[PDB]
Design a protein around this ligand. Structure first.
Ligand SMILES: Cc1cc2nc3c(=O)[nH]c(=O)nc-3n(C[C@H](O)[C@H](O)[C@H](O)COP(=O)(O)O)c2cc1C
Ligand SMILES: Cc1cc2nc3c(=O)[nH]c(=O)nc-3n(C[C@H](O)[C@H](O)[C@H](O)COP(=O)(O)O)c2cc1C
Lengths: 349, 346
């Protein structure tokens, strides 16, 4: 199908997934120059810094690229809950001769609570703007579209996909249970249908009319071929690009992904406050276990964890790192992004 | 390919489905060119033999006979007595009271020695195993006669154990699948891998023909699995609405209707994780007030007692209505006609 590639003015139906902390302008430009759609994530950063990152990408590529923003429900501070969480983490900090932070901060501002992001986006005009955890109001999506920007939203169910349609997006990113990183569920408090890529992509393509981008578990040309047979118009690959040299994955992350840990992934809500999939470690614990206090809101939880990670890292310890990977992780390859992009295009045939 | 490995013309297996599959359904699929299947667990061996003879009465073509190979359930009177006490108000609602004791109503292939020699005589083209792999010993014993041996796995780790046991094929069950999850050891957790990842993994780093199971509802779904490296396909939910199936009317209406839009996993129906259309038997076993679960299949024994009492009042809110995550794509056709349509779409 030409549906997606024509929609975004690119050659290849391949998006390199925006991965906050792992994607980079070098990674994005590499994929975009190679004919796909490279991406960056700019949540957690001030608008002008977002604006700089976009321009960094432009200085590397003249081809379309994707800019991703978190659109979650703005986190609700709860100092009592947050204090009880910190006290619970106290022995972990003490292990590295450290103390937990005194307070926690809303480190990731939602697109719905930072008014300055939309106007900056309407100025920079990246070819694509994608959202995770929810959809903006239709008039906001329309404003970006009015300026030539394609709008992507991640959905995890047919019900969420309907909301993406109502928001007026140009394409839906259909994220199956296989996907590495944070799950795109809109309202985790209602539960999580946890639908696999194969079913979700088929359900959205066969019973919907929006171009579908399949995300989760896709690691090669056979996977891409399979996604297209299901009716997707393109794929989004995260894990597959992590070992690329252009990525900002650290040493230990690359080692975990290259090694035997890659055979088994798991979901955690205790790392960030929102369900996410990666290589299990000490930050993957049972929040339902005895003596574990109620969980603070996302993203305050991640703030607490990031403080612990820093303390851990200050003693050579990476057992608390966020090493996100999808269920196809064992098929991970290590190539320069543009060479990987083209290997995929070849395997895609 | 796999289609040569078994005596068949089409690479589509109609999943064996305890209480849903019938000799009539199996025969219709086998006569149409695929591999029809029945489930034999929970029947004494001479009763399972009778069922196999029923299928032979309707088709000369190959079929599949399925047996549970789970870690045999272990009785805990204290835990079971507390479970039934917790269910007591549900029973009471339909004028019943919980059964005295619970029973091991489904004997694993590991604890009933009379199943293997029956299978040796009857010699169906295919014998499949769910929840675990039997000793390579016995797989060879079946393979010595005409039999191709299939075992379901939910992870590459389980697939390796399948390979070790000398099976002719591994059924790769993704998270999408309806009914009981084939996880060998659930108390060790459950990786809950999706079909798309699982098939690719097993086809990329495995040696056995892999049969994709979970979420496939049409020819595009079959083509996708084949692109992933599958040699064939196993489909349960797609066949439930076939008039030949053993699905009762309430079940058929549920799957045809809006409830098909959402499935979920429950361990409280049977004591082992299973995917279906949620109802009053889908509750939170971690919830305050809910006691430790008995082993599988003792829990299902209790549930069935409750299902009887609910049915006698015309209440279907406790039924076992299994369905995979592709449930909303279900179609209602004669089984042979569905297989023909699938083949055309493929
Ligand atoms: C390390 C990592 C970071 C990710 N970061 C983001 C992110 O910041 N925003 C987002 O919308 N998706 C993020 N994703 C998910 C992708 O959008 C996509 O759903 C996923 O990578 C596809 O599954 P796969 O890893 O199996 O290819 C991330 C995934 C990983 C593995
Ligand atoms: C109602 C129902 C009953 C099932 N019964 C069995 C069974 O008795 N033994 C078994 O090994 N698998 C059983 N399965 C699972 C199938 O083998 C297969 O894994 C699953 O149906 C494939 O997922 P699908 O429903 O999306 O096609 C059953 C599935 C359903 C929906």
């Amino acid at each position: 199908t030409d549906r997606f590639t024509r929609l975004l003015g690119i050659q290849q139906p391949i998006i390199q997934a925006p991965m906050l902390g792992v994607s980079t302008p070098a990674l994005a430009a590499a994929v975009s120059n190679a004919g796909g759609l490279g991406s960056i994530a700019i949540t957690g950063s001030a608008a002008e810094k977002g604006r700089a990152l976009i321009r960094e990408v432009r200085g590397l590529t003249d081809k379309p690229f994707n800019v991703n923003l978190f659109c979650h429900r703005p986190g609700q501070a709860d100092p009592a809950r947050e204090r009880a969480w910190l006290d619970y983490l106290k022995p972990l900090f003490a292990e590295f001769g450290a103390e937990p932070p005194v307070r926690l901060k809303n480190i990731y501002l939602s697109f719905l609570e930072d008014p300055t992001l939309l106007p900056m986006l309407l100025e920079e005009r990246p070819a694509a703007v994608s959202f995770h955890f929810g959809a903006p109001p239709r008039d906001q999506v329309r404003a970006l579209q009015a300026v030539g920007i394609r709008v992507l939203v991640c959905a995890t169910t047919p019900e969420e996909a309907a909301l993406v349609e109502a928001a007026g997006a140009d394409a839906v990113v259909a994220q199956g249970i296989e996907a590495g990183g944070h799950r795109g569920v809109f309202e985790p408090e209602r539960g999580d249908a946890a639908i696999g890529t194969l079913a979700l992509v088929r359900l959205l393509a066969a019973r919907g009319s929006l171009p579908v981008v399949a995300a989760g578990g896709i690691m090669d040309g056979r996977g891409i071929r399979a996604a297209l047979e299901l009716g997707a118009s393109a794929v989004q690959m995260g894990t597959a690009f992590v070992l690329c040299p252009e990525s900002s994955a650290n040493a230990a992350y690359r080692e975990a992904l290259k090694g035997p840990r890659a055979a088994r992934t798991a979901l955690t809500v205790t790392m960030s406050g929102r369900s996410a999939r990666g290589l299990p470690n000490r930050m993957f614990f049972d929040a339902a276990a005895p003596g574990v206090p109620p969980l603070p809101d996302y993203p305050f939880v991640y703030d607490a964890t990031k403080a612990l990670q820093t303390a851990a890292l200050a003693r050579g310890n990476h057992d608390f790192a966020a090493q996100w990977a999808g269920q196809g992780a064992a098929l991970a390859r290590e190539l320069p992004a543009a060479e990987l992009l083209r290997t995929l295009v070849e395997e895609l045939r």
